[PDB]
Structure formats: C-alpha cells, structure tokens
C-alpha cells in the first residue's frame, strides 16, 4: 500500500530548516564562527558527523570543534543539508569542495569536480 | 548558486528512518494506548499537534507524551512521517484516518477518504 507523497520528504526538510531559523530544538553548535543545528540532520547527511555522534565511547556534547576548515565552505554545506540547495560560486567553490570530503559527503564531493572542471 | 539534489530530501528521510530503526538520538516516547520511539524534530515537521506540544514551555522538555488513540493507526502514520509511504487497508483505514485528524495531518486524510469511497 504505497500512497507515496513524493512531496512529503521535502516538506519535512523545509520544516526542519524553519525549526533551525526559529532555533527550535537545536542540540548542537559546530564551531568553524558558530553554527547551530540539529544532530539528527547532521547525521543523516554527513558520514563524519554520523561517525562522531554514534561513537558510544565519545562524550555526547552540545558543542563540536571542527579542526582550519573553511567557515564559508561549512555554512554553504550546512544550508544545503537543510535546503537541498548547493550554492557554488567561483569565489567559494574551492572552500566548499574541501569541507565536503572532510564531512564525507561523497555525492557532494563529485558535484564540485564537475563545476570546477567546467568553464 | 542553486544546485538542488532531487534525491536528497529523500536520502535525509531514510537516514532519519534508519536512526529511528536503530534507536539513535530519539528523544521522545509517544505512549499511544503502546510505546513509540521517535525524534521530536520529525514529529513537529509532520504534525501541527506535535508542533503545539513541543513548543510549549509548560510541557518542555518532557520525554514522555502520553496521548485514547489507536496504536496501529499511530504506527502506520509514524511509518508515514519517516518514509513518505502511507500503508492503508480496510482494517486500519478507519484507524489511520482518525489518528490523522487528531494529529492535524490533512493530506493523508484526503487520501483515506478517497480510498474508502473508491472501493465502496
């Protein structure tokens, strides 16, 4: 019985992005500058954040210090995680690609290769 | 400056489902009549009821929200919230439609009705 709401996955994500704007139930700050977010959204999108939050040995912490990753490159990936929309310019594209491979977003890393080899 | 990944809302939802499926980072027990583990964030994104509940300071930051509602009808809607699939059947359709209203979910309600008046 598959009455698929192909809009409902994206409704959910837009609604998660509003909660972040409204600051409703953010349970983490990532420092790179300060970026507030939901651990669950980070986890679903990013192999490393998922790799961090699932480690039963590590402390569960409301603050996560990223090691010099581009803050610009992280703000663009963050907004992607919440909007599905990847902003790339020539002036930031290198910033963005880097942070992906570290964040382990394997489909986001391929997307930067194509836009860089372009033009 | 606007490259949207059209399978990405959907990958986010299935990864959120697997978290729920592994009981990872879930922060609320919904006690329906049975228990249901889920994440506040997702309930609030799908439900105006759960939205009102979790933005109330008097009932923040409660771990347990006891809702009488049917469990099976809740279970199928909880499935829907995390999977975008609505699993309807003559035997639950009345149960889902009802839970649906009480949750203020109207898009699936419409769907139950039309399933009801499609067979009969």
UniProtKB/Swiss-Prot annotation, chain B:
Effect of residue 52 to A: Abolished ubiquitination by the SCF(FBXL17) complex
Tissue-specific expression: Expressed in germinal center T- and B-cells and in primary immature dendritic cells.
Protein location: Nucleus
PTM (free text): Phosphorylated by ATM in response to genotoxic stress. Phosphorylation induces its degradation by ubiquitin/proteasome pathway. Polyubiquitinated. Polyubiquitinated by SCF(FBXO11), leading to its degradation by the proteasome. Ubiquitinated by the SCF(FBXL17) complex, leading to its degradation by the proteasome: ubiquitination by the SCF(FBXL17) complex takes place when aberrant BTB domain dimers are formed.
Domain BTB: 26-90
Induction remarks: Down-regulated during maturation of dendritic cells by selective stimuli such as bacterial lipopolysaccharides (LPS), CD40LG and zymosan. Protein levels decreases upon genotoxic stress in a dose- and time-dependent way.
Disease linked to the protein: Chromosomal aberrations involving BCL6 are a cause of B-cell non-Hodgkin lymphomas (B-cell NHL), including diffuse large B-cell lymphoma and follicular lymphoma. Approximately 40% of diffuse large B-cell lymphomas and 5 to 10% of follicular lymphomas are associated with chromosomal translocations that deregulate expression of BCL6 by juxtaposing heterologous promoters to the BCL6 coding domain. Translocation t(3;14)(q27;q32). Translocation t(3;22)(q27;q11) with immunoglobulin gene regions. Translocation t(3;7)(q27;p12) with IKZF1 gene 5'non-coding region. A chromosomal aberration involving BCL6 may be a cause of a form of B-cell leukemia. Translocation t(3;11)(q27;q23) with POU2AF1/OBF1.
Subunit and interaction comment: Homodimer. Interacts (via BTB domain) with the corepressors BCOR, NCOR1 and SMRT/NCOR2; the interactions are direct. Forms preferably ternary complexes with BCOR and SMRT/NCOR2 on target gene promoters but, on enhancer elements, interacts with SMRT/NCOR2 and HDAC3 to repress proximal gene expression. Interacts with histone deacetylases HDAC2, HDAC5 and HDAC9 (via the catalytic domain). Interacts with ZBTB7 and BCL6B. Interacts with SCF(FBXO11) complex; the interaction is independent of phosphorylation and promotes ubiquitination.
UniProt free text on domains: The BTB domain mediates homodimerization. Its dimer interface mediates peptide binding such as to corepressors BCOR and NCOR2. Interaction with corepressors through the BTB domain is needed to facilitate the rapid proliferation and survival of GC B-cells but is not involved in the T(FH) formation and BCL6-mediated suppression of T(H)2 and T(H)17 differentiationrequired for GC formation.
Its biological purpose: Transcriptional repressor mainly required for germinal center (GC) formation and antibody affinity maturation which has different mechanisms of action specific to the lineage and biological functions. Forms complexes with different corepressors and histone deacetylases to repress the transcriptional expression of different subsets of target genes. Represses its target genes by binding directly to the DNA sequence 5'-TTCCTAGAA-3' (BCL6-binding site) or indirectly by repressing the transcriptional activity of transcription factors.
Protein name: B-cell lymphoma 6 protein
Organism of this sequence: Homo sapiens (Human)
Lineage of the organism: Eukaryota, Metazoa, Chordata, Craniata, Vertebrata
Gene, per the UniProt record: BCL6
